[PDB]
């Protein structure tokens, strides 16, 4: 891992980190190479689906195989999908065992075994040739595809006459590649999956839906007797948390207009206390927007205690407002020295509002993992409590 | 003209384009044609069966097109086959074989020479003589590991077969791209037609995916925010042509207004007998401008 | 006066967007797969003639 | 458009080893990098040019950066002295003056 | 630009023609729009 | 856990998989836990509970 | 002590865009236990057995 101080361009920082990245590959081993993360956090993991079948027709090795080579190529198209984890199964593995005492009484070494291995299975062609008129071109394949081609292989062999081969010193079969990772569903067990993960920054609900009518579409692919079973819907919990936003901020103008009812025995503020918010709301969701900083719980905790502490400035006005008229109910231009009047009760309101958000501050200097989680529900407040004040003006 | 019917030879279709339309046109990776599929696979026999049983159902289809499966496999070959059983009587690597059908009769470059500040390839093959011809690579002359006196065809079968003169590929894996084009109609419906008439009643291989993709696509987007554009435009055009005078009259006479107006414009394309562009819109959306300037500065008076 | 109008609007004239015209003209024919190097230096002689 | 050319050259060879050998290593790599749309590239016989396609309107050196992530972790799993070339820097456009 | 044209315009002509058809029925509307509509109006 | 009559579906995972994010062994035991709503199944029994 | 005793993968092998490990071992049996190490049979560059 190689950390940055936080706020760093991602994109930059990861393309630093390549810098020296290239200095290296020669270094290490043979085959074994350095590979860069992926591009989302810890909190890319979305989506996770297990690939289980309803019978037992088709094999773990090859459900493994169904998920490396289809599936997950199949999801990856997906736009902010970084890459499409692949989780237990089990690997389909060419395994050629050697037999010591076949070893020994033939001769050949392992040395020369594994030399043999790395030429018996490659591909080539030299150029083209001018038989008639048009240009052949000509290949030729050493291609392992075969037990027998396994078998095959000659490894010491004379003059006049026979060849040993590997078949002779070892038996070629399929077998489970050393696991890495074990993946299991309930108590019926053993199965092979994969999981799905957002590209940093980018409405997950989206990516999610986008996976799911890709996944509805595919399962008319897929071969006799395999489920894709969700094991996970990071959808749910947005839904869940969004919907339950969507009900309190409605649950408030009605608790707000009821209270309002009561003092001042009806009034169209109905429609002016639900004006002042969504546009004291609509300011917040204009500035995170060009600071662009997201959509969590905490921003959207944020909004909703504002809502409450920006009810004086509409309340107040009213109340002014309402004492105002009722002193010509005692007794254009009329309309206006209410409005006045309504003018004389504002500076102090307007100016308590503005002087509410600077004191936040010190909630931005905090500076741990956690300060920086709470920065959201400040940041939606700090900037949306401004906007209020100018709001309470309009 | 003139040209076209000047330079005429057989397997040449002419095609005349400009300069830097053209150096632009075979960059651009995609399809021209107004649709086209895609059949994603794991091995290329399975894909390509699907292309030839996709063409019927495009030629059936209510729609005018030409089903281009595949103008690619027009690769001549000629296939060495190394039989491995053969190559080992003979105590010799598949590899070694193949150094024969590499360098002798390929002529794979073993490396440069350094002249200062430049750098030719050294090439080392068998003679033109006997690379001229299929029988030529049967007799092939192969010395073995043990100083015998072989011929590739001893070691392998050499067939001529016809395969790809080219491979494209869809995001790492093979895709074959069926160029289905219908002219001058708004082809969205066809698709839909075609995505659900072969699910029921034509099937499908296991391993494989069917992608639709064509200049409707990014079209139908293109039309798709348009339309939510002139409610959005009409709804500014209508603040801002009620405040100078107020009344709703007269800004709705002009946009009532406006289409009269275009129509000199139009019957210009008469004569022309002209086509219309993005640009003849360009023209009407300016036209629409001055007419409705010429309205305000009139009603004011 | 709007019918006359739209009588056409539905017909539409003839043709849709232009290509454009650049003093030098690039030619390129669909010309099929496999041939020869020499084959190939001899057509574009041949081209470059007529 | 928004693209990144990679051109890598095989002196001689065929549509299948050309892809099965070089850009079969180039175009999966390249899946993952970041930002990438569509990974489609044209193999064939001696050849082989993968183009990466951004959506519209991204820092070009940007993408051709992103591109590059994961070029590095390729070059040693295709040929020996075969190599993958980023493009130039210039669009379709950018062929100005040619002289014989 | 109608006239002649030895550097691109099969563009400028395209939205340059609307707007002389508009410009002969444009000013005629200007004029029969503005009294007619207008009483019928109120 | 299946046991429970809370939990809907059940995920065991033991090691990494196949990426570059997840570092664990094949001793580390990573289950995903699914939950139904609490509209089922039980009286009283909240989250800290079920635990 | 890596190929006959580990199992190093000694190459892995294409079918069409799909690649499946090779594996190069002493049987199971021999790389049991400890003393199954100790045991290892070892043949030398002098067809010694040890
Ligand atoms: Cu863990």
């Not at chain 1, 890319?44 to 297990?50: D, N, Q, V």
């Not at chain 1, 897929?222 to 339950?244: C, F, H, K, M, W």
């Amino acid at each position: 891992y190689v950390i940055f101080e936080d706020g760093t361009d991602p994109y930059w920082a990861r393309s630093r980190v390549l810098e020296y990245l290239n200095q290296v590959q020669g270094k290490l081993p043979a085959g074994v190479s350095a590979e860069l993360g992926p591009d989302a956090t810890g909190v890319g993991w979305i989506y996770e689906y297990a690939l289980v079948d309803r019978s037992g027709k088709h094999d773990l090795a090859d459900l493994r195989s169904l998920q490396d080579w289809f599936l997950k190529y199949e999801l990856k198209t997906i736009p902010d999908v970084a890459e499409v984890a692949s989780v237990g199964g089990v690997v389909k593995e060419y395994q050629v065992v050697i037999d010591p005492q076949r070893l020994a009484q033939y001769g050949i070494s392992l040395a020369e075994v594994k030399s043999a291995l790395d030429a018996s299975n490659q591909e080539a062609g030299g150029s083209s040739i001018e038989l008639a008129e048009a240009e052949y071109m000509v290949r030729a394949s050493g291609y392992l595809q075969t037990l027998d081609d396994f078998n095959h292989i000659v490894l010491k062999a004379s003059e006049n006459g026979v060849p040993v081969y590997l078949r002779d010193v070892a038996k070629v079969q399929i077998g489970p590649e050393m696991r890495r990772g074990i993946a299991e569903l309930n108590g019926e067990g053993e199965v092979a999956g994969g999981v799905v993960i957002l590209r940093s920054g980018k409405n997950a609900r989206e990516v999610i839906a986008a996976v799911k009518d890709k996944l509805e579409t595919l399962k008319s692919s897929l071969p006799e007797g395999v489920e894709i079973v969700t094991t996970y819907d990071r959808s749910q919990l947005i839904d869940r948390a969004i919907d339950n936003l969507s009900g309190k901020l409605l649950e408030e103008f009605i608790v707000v207009a009821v209270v309002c009812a009561l003092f001042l025995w009806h009034v169209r503020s109905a429609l002016v206390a639900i004006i002042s918010l969504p546009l004291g709301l609509c300011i917040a969701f204009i500035v995170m927007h060009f600071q662009g900083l997201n959509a969590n719980i905490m921003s959207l905790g944020g909004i909703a205690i504002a809502v409450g502490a920006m009810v004086d400035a509409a309340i107040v006005m009213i109340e002014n407002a309402h004492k105002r008229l009722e002193e010509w109910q005692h007794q254009k231009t009329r309309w206006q020295v209410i409005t006045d009047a309504s003018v004389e009760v504002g500076p102090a309101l307007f100016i308590s509002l503005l002087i509410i958000t600077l004191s936040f501050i010190p909630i931005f200097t905090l500076e741990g993992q956690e300060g920086r989680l709470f920065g959201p529900l400040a940041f939606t407040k700090t900037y949306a409590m401004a906007g209020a004040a100018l709001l309470a003006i309009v | 003209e003139e040209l076209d019917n000047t330079v005429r030879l057989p397997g040449l279709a002419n095609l005349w384009v400009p300069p830097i339309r053209n150096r632009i046109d075979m960059l651009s990776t995609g399809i021209k044609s107004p649709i086209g599929i895609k059949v994603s696979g794991t091995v290329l026999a399975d894909i390509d069966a699907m292309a030839e049983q996709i063409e019927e159902v495009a030629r059936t289809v209510p729609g005018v097109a030409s089903a281009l499966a595949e103008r690619l496999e027009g690769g001549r070959y000629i296939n060495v086959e190394i039989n491995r059983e053969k190559a080992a009587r003979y105590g010799m690597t598949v590899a070694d074989v193949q150094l024969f059908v590499t360098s002798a009769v390929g002529g794979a470059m073993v490396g440069e020479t350094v002249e200062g500040i430049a750098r030719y390839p050294i090439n080392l093959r068998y003679p033109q003589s006997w690379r001229d011809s299929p029988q030529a690579l049967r007799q092939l002359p192969i010395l073995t590991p043990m100083k015998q006196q072989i011929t590739l065809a001893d070691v392998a079968d050499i067939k001529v077969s016809t395969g790809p003169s080219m491979l494209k590929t869809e995001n790492a894996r093979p895709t074959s791209w069926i160029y289905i084009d219908a002219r001058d109609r708004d082809m969205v419906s066809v698709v839909h037609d075609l995505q659900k008439a072969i699910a029921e009643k034509v099937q499908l291989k296991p391993g494989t995916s069917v992608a639709f993709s064509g200049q409707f696509e990014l079209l139908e987007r293109a039309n798709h925010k348009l339309k939510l554009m002139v409610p959005m435009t009409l709804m500014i055009i209508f603040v801002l042509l009620y405040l100078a005078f107020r009344r709703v009259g007269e800004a709705l006479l002009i946009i009532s207004s406006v289409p009269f107006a275009l129509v000199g414009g139009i019957w210009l394309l008469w004569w022309m007998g002209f086509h219309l562009s993005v640009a003849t819109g360009t023209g009407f959306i300016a036209l629409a401008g001055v007419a409705a300037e010429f309205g305000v500065v009139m009603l004011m008076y | 006066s709007v019918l006359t109008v739209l009588w056409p609007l539905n017909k539409v004239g003839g043709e849709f967007l232009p290509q454009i015209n650049e003093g030098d003209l690039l030619y390129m024919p669909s010309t099929l797969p496999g041939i020869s190097a020499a084959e190939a230096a001899s057509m574009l002689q041949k081209t470059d003639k007529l | 458009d928004v693209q990144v050319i990679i051109k890598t050259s095989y002196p001689g060879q065929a549509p299948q080893i050309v892809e099965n050998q070089v850009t079969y290593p180039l175009t999966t790599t390249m899946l993952s990098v970041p930002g990438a749309k569509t990974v489609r590239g044209f193999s064939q016989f001696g050849d082989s040019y993968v183009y990466v396609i951004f959506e519209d309107g991204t820092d070009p050196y940007w993408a051709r950066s992103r591109v590059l992530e994961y070029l590095n972790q390729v070059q040693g799993k295709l040929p020996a002295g075969v190599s993958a070339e980023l493009g130039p820097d210039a669009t379709g456009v950018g062929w100005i003056y040619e002289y014989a | 630009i109608l006239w002649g044209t030895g550097a691109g315009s099969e563009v400028m002509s395209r939205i340059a023609a609307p707007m002389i058809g508009g410009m002969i029925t444009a000013p005629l509307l200007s004029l029969f729009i503005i009294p007619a509509a207008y009483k019928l109006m109120w | 856990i299946m046991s429970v009559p809370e939990v809907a579906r059940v995920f065991g995972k033991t090691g990494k998989a196949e990426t570059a994010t997840d570092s664990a062994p094949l001793e580390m035991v990573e289950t995903t836990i699914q939950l139904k709503p609490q509209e089922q199944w039980r009286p009283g029994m909240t989250m800290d509970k079920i635990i």
